[PDB]
Write an enzyme that holds these catalytic residues in place. Sequence first.
Site, PDB file in Angstrom:
ATOM      1  N   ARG A   1      -1.289  -5.996  -7.183  1.00  0.00           N
ATOM      2  CA  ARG A   1      -0.400  -6.907  -6.646  1.00  0.00           C
ATOM      3  C   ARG A   1      -0.732  -8.338  -6.903  1.00  0.00           C
ATOM      4  NH1 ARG A   1      -3.412 -10.015  -3.013  1.00  0.00           N
ATOM      5  NH2 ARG A   1      -5.288  -9.001  -2.079  1.00  0.00           N
TER       6      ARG A   1
ATOM      7  N   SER B   1      -2.918  -7.605   3.354  1.00  0.00           N
ATOM      8  CA  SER B   1      -3.577  -7.335   4.533  1.00  0.00           C
ATOM      9  C   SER B   1      -3.817  -8.599   5.178  1.00  0.00           C
ATOM     10  CB  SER B   1      -4.684  -6.300   4.767  1.00  0.00           C
ATOM     11  OG  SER B   1      -4.217  -4.907   4.318  1.00  0.00           O
TER      12      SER B   1
ATOM     13  N   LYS C   1     -17.935  -5.954   8.035  1.00  0.00           N
ATOM     14  CA  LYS C   1     -16.673  -6.344   7.378  1.00  0.00           C
ATOM     15  C   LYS C   1     -15.865  -6.864   8.549  1.00  0.00           C
TER      16      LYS C   1
ATOM     17  N   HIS D   1       0.794  -1.355   0.006  1.00  0.00           N
ATOM     18  CA  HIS D   1       0.052   0.119  -0.144  1.00  0.00           C
ATOM     19  C   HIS D   1       0.948   1.162   0.050  1.00  0.00           C
ATOM     20  CE1 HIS D   1      -2.802  -2.843   2.166  1.00  0.00           C
ATOM     21  NE2 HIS D   1      -3.239  -2.886   1.005  1.00  0.00           N
TER      22      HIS D   1
HETATM   23  C1  LIG Z   1      -1.724  -2.970  -3.275  1.00  0.00           C
HETATM   24  C2  LIG Z   1      -2.870  -2.284  -3.063  1.00  0.00           C
HETATM   25  C3  LIG Z   1      -4.053  -3.024  -3.089  1.00  0.00           C
HETATM   26  N1  LIG Z   1      -5.045  -1.961  -3.122  1.00  0.00           N
HETATM   27  C4  LIG Z   1      -6.394  -2.424  -3.088  1.00  0.00           C
HETATM   28  C5  LIG Z   1      -6.923  -2.477  -1.438  1.00  0.00           C
HETATM   29  C6  LIG Z   1      -8.531  -2.490  -1.436  1.00  0.00           C
HETATM   30  O1  LIG Z   1      -9.121  -2.655  -2.559  1.00  0.00           O
HETATM   31  N2  LIG Z   1      -8.874  -2.863  -0.007  1.00  0.00           N
HETATM   32  S1  LIG Z   1     -10.666  -2.991   0.258  1.00  0.00           S
HETATM   33  O2  LIG Z   1     -10.605  -3.603   1.348  1.00  0.00           O
HETATM   34  O3  LIG Z   1     -10.793  -4.180  -1.018  1.00  0.00           O
HETATM   35  C7  LIG Z   1     -11.572  -1.659  -0.212  1.00  0.00           C
HETATM   36  C8  LIG Z   1     -11.451  -1.207  -1.645  1.00  0.00           C
HETATM   37  C9  LIG Z   1     -12.215   0.162  -1.927  1.00  0.00           C
HETATM   38  C10 LIG Z   1     -12.836   0.748  -0.851  1.00  0.00           C
HETATM   39  O4  LIG Z   1     -13.682   1.865  -1.286  1.00  0.00           O
HETATM   40  C11 LIG Z   1     -13.956   2.964  -0.196  1.00  0.00           C
HETATM   41  C12 LIG Z   1     -13.034   3.253   0.470  1.00  0.00           C
HETATM   42  C13 LIG Z   1     -13.166   4.246   1.682  1.00  0.00           C
HETATM   43  C14 LIG Z   1     -14.926   4.692   1.668  1.00  0.00           C
HETATM   44  C15 LIG Z   1     -15.670   4.053   0.892  1.00  0.00           C
HETATM   45  C16 LIG Z   1     -15.240   3.138   0.134  1.00  0.00           C
HETATM   46  C17 LIG Z   1     -12.837   0.189   0.639  1.00  0.00           C
HETATM   47  C18 LIG Z   1     -11.901  -0.761   0.741  1.00  0.00           C
HETATM   48  C19 LIG Z   1      -4.542  -0.507  -3.020  1.00  0.00           C
HETATM   49  C20 LIG Z   1      -5.272   0.346  -2.870  1.00  0.00           C
HETATM   50  C21 LIG Z   1      -4.557   1.469  -2.719  1.00  0.00           C
HETATM   51  C22 LIG Z   1      -3.148   1.667  -2.758  1.00  0.00           C
HETATM   52  C23 LIG Z   1      -2.508   0.423  -2.968  1.00  0.00           C
HETATM   53  C24 LIG Z   1      -3.068  -0.872  -2.846  1.00  0.00           C
END
Ligand SMILES: Cc1cn(CCC(=O)NS(=O)(=O)c2ccc(Oc3ccccc3)cc2)c2ccccc12
Lengths: 155, 157, 157, 155, 157, 157
Positions: free
Chosen positions: B90, B127, B41, B17
């Site tokens: 990734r 994660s 979640k 990240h």
């Molecule tokens: C290496 C790398 C992988 N990822 C993906 C991370 C990811 O998707 N986590 S997730 O749990 O699925 C997820 C996705 C979207 C979301 O949208 C919102 C967020 C806040 C408020 C409302 C909606 C929320 C959670 C990254 C992202 C950024 C930089 C680097 C990386």
Amino acid sequence: MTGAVCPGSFDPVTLGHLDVFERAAAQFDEVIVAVLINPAGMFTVDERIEMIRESTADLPNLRVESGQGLLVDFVRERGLNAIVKGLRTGTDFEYELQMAQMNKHIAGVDTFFVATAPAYSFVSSSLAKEVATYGGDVSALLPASVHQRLLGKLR
Amino acid sequence: MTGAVCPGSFDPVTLGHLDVFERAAAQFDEVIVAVLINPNKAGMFTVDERIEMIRESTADLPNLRVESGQGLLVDFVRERGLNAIVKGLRTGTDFEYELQMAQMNKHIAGVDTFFVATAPAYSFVSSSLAKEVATYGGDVSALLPASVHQRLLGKLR
Amino acid sequence: MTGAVCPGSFDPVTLGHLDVFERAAAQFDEVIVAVLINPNKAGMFTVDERIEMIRESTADLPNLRVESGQGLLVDFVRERGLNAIVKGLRTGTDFEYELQMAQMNKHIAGVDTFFVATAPAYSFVSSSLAKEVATYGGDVSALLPASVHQRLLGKLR
Amino acid sequence: MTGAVCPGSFDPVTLGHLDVFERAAAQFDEVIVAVLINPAGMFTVDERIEMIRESTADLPNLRVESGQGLLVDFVRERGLNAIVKGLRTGTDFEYELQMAQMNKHIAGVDTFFVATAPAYSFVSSSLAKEVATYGGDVSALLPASVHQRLLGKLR
Amino acid sequence: MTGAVCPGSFDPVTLGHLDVFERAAAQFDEVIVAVLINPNKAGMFTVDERIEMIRESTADLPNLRVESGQGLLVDFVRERGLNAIVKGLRTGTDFEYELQMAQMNKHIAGVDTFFVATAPAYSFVSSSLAKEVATYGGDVSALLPASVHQRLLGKLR
Amino acid sequence: MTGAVCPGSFDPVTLGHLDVFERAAAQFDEVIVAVLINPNKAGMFTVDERIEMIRESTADLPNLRVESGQGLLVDFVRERGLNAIVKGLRTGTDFEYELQMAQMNKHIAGVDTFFVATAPAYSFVSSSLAKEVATYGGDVSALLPASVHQRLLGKLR
Ligand SMILES: Cc1cn(CCC(=O)NS(=O)(=O)c2ccc(Oc3ccccc3)cc2)c2ccccc12
Ligand SMILES: Cc1cn(CCC(=O)NS(=O)(=O)c2ccc(Oc3ccccc3)cc2)c2ccccc12
Ligand SMILES: Cc1cn(CCC(=O)NS(=O)(=O)c2ccc(Oc3ccccc3)cc2)c2ccccc12
Ligand SMILES: Cc1cn(CCC(=O)NS(=O)(=O)c2ccc(Oc3ccccc3)cc2)c2ccccc12
């Protein structure tokens, strides 16, 4: 003194699994089939081990053992550092690659992937159970012993 | 004034990240790391803990800020006057689903999604996988910010 | 005398689905939309609602009919004297899993599966993503037939 | 008496290749690096063999031999029936799978795939040559010997 | 009256192709196997040889005919009053490119493309790989029609 | 002061390319379209023709400029004081190869690559497929800017 570990839940073991076991047993001096303990499945660990042992009796250099926790610990605690894992049609290969790189990083264990035979490439433990549950014939896709055991669980 | 949002649960933030955060911060005037609040979640760290871990990790990035968010990502983005998402790739990323969501997000709100592959060194951490490995005593210290690693050992005790 | 079955949970039917229905109806003498129901999990819409939404948006397809079922798709297909499945492809489709099921379905029942890519305009909608986006206020009206959109909003409110 | 063959043109051998050689050498009693003769490349077969031999001198159970025609014939004529092949970022894995299934079908030879280290996952012989041609520094991605040899071909 | 075209160079026809031909013939009233004439595509068998090998292989399929063609596939299709293509999928199929062409073909001519995976037994043969293996004395007799195999050994002598 | 380079051979530029240009121009202060030329293979259009077709269809983008180059993309980027590439994704994109080049480009020059999916409507056009289809009479007028379409037909005739 070469060796590899073939890991899975094997719930139940399929001919796709067996094909890969046989190839691993043919190419490594020693093979351990690592059966996950992680209880939500159909067969108990003992049953799953039995089915594999029954199906691999002509593989003298293969043994079957249950395990839990990190796979790399299972592998390393037996003096090995190779995993042999099968590929089939629905394999999430991206996730496999991620785990392979992680397992190498944390424990220096190599993962070798081998595609199972085309004839056994579309069976999986889950799909076999699902199909058999609804009366579909998966007998060509499972060891004869397993197939009978499965019918027993359903009926 | 350009800007992008980097979205995720970041539970916890990894060096994967962070690498993408750094690249976003280098390429946009403003970056917001959007930390998901998600009651249903299942997770290890609270939103405040997750925000603090990110802030520690991004202390050298003055144009990046960390905020919590809920609901539709594109609303989070547009509420802050932006219309770009920067997301990492990734090993193990479901890219087909990412594409689907990117096309959906462009359709419903006009928000662009830029994808960046994280560095090879950090390409196999996630994660979820970091937590799982650490839970069973595996060493993922090379894949996480130092402060994160310390907190993680703390949650497992 | 030719015929194909178009399967899915259709909860709700999308314009991506309708595109595939239209193409199947144009290429086979008869088409049956098979609304497959899991008796152990209610979706958003009841079976009768799902069928009604499909019928209303397929009224211009005289050779298409809609029926529900459960259990093995290939039994549904064979019991109707047919031997073909037509399944749509979209962005986010798990094609490897579709391939696995197609090979299994051919193996156990001799049924063929024909895949067709849905139109680009409808290539990123899915029932699940449309529901998720609409849940948080996103405008998915252009991706669903009129028979669906406000009924969807109704369920959500 | 286990053994595997690692095949390629290796024009030139990269650290991605070497990583996989080292893993194969660690997991099989005997490894043969099969160097294709098929002359349109940069290095001659002798040079390509030299570079691999130079880079694998600390691998006692690995040898390097040229070959042509069907890979499975190369493998079987040496009493083996395993291929170890690396995976990198730009690998055409679908084609690899096709060839693996064909090679199993026609000759009973297994193919084991192993992902090269992340650090070496984006180098390929072709991309290394291309980048170096235009002045890019690929020294971290090739054996020190190879790198010097490459500069020699370019300059 | 339904119909589809199965396109290819078929140099030579394999059991992978035949399997898909058979499925197409089982599911459409009329099938045309469209054999590419391509002066600048390097090949082993002449168009007449390729057509004859297909005809031998499909002798039991009365609703399938074999014709040579050139240029735009969608024109071949539409000239015969059809608007469906049936194409096989095998291991090594460039499916992303197939999708691109399918979407292009639908856009420029309204022609649908249905994809069918060939049986696992025939999933790893291709015309090119069969020729290459046979050239070096590999046995691909289980993967080709008998008559094809005989002709192939003939061209290699 | 932010900026990105949009690279390609653009022989000719398509509406898929233009979509990506517009998105880059909307998210970065400046955008340079890099028309990369292989000095050892003439394409259909000369460099001046390629540039003219791009300029004519980007006249509404004040912060975009167009320049040709050859050799390493990262040199083109760095020599302009920039550190970012924006590359479009479409159906048929070899993404693994794009990923490989992105990781290599970061390694040798510290340049970041941002990928963005082009709009569904333009997701199946490529310069090569447009040329091939137009060669045999196919109508690709809706997939190319006006600056291109008839110039393309001109080259072909
Ligand atoms: C290496 C790398 C992988 N990822 C993906 C991370 C990811 O998707 N986590 S997730 O749990 O699925 C997820 C996705 C979207 C979301 O949208 C919102 C967020 C806040 C408020 C409302 C909606 C929320 C959670 C990254 C992202 C950024 C930089 C680097 C990386
Ligand atoms: C030989 C072979 C394996 N697979 C994949 C099967 C698989 O991954 N099952 S799994 O449920 O997900 C799984 C994976 C890893 C595990 O690691 C441990 C195991 C034991 C103890 C601790 C950890 C446990 C379970 C095959 C596919 C097709 C043909 C052959 C094969
Ligand atoms: C160990 C390793 C291999 N590769 C792939 C390299 C590759 O396929 N090169 S290739 O030009 O296409 C090729 C393939 C097969 C061949 O078969 C024969 C070889 C000798 C004699 C007769 C036949 C010949 C050439 C790697 C990638 C990354 C990390 C490690 C590895
Ligand atoms: C297992 C399987 C694979 N394929 C793909 C075969 C293929 O694409 N061969 S190809 O050389 O590239 C090719 C493609 C399209 C063409 O279009 C025209 C044809 C005639 C006249 C004008 C245009 C021509 C050649 C199959 C197809 C049908 C049933 C089964 C299978």
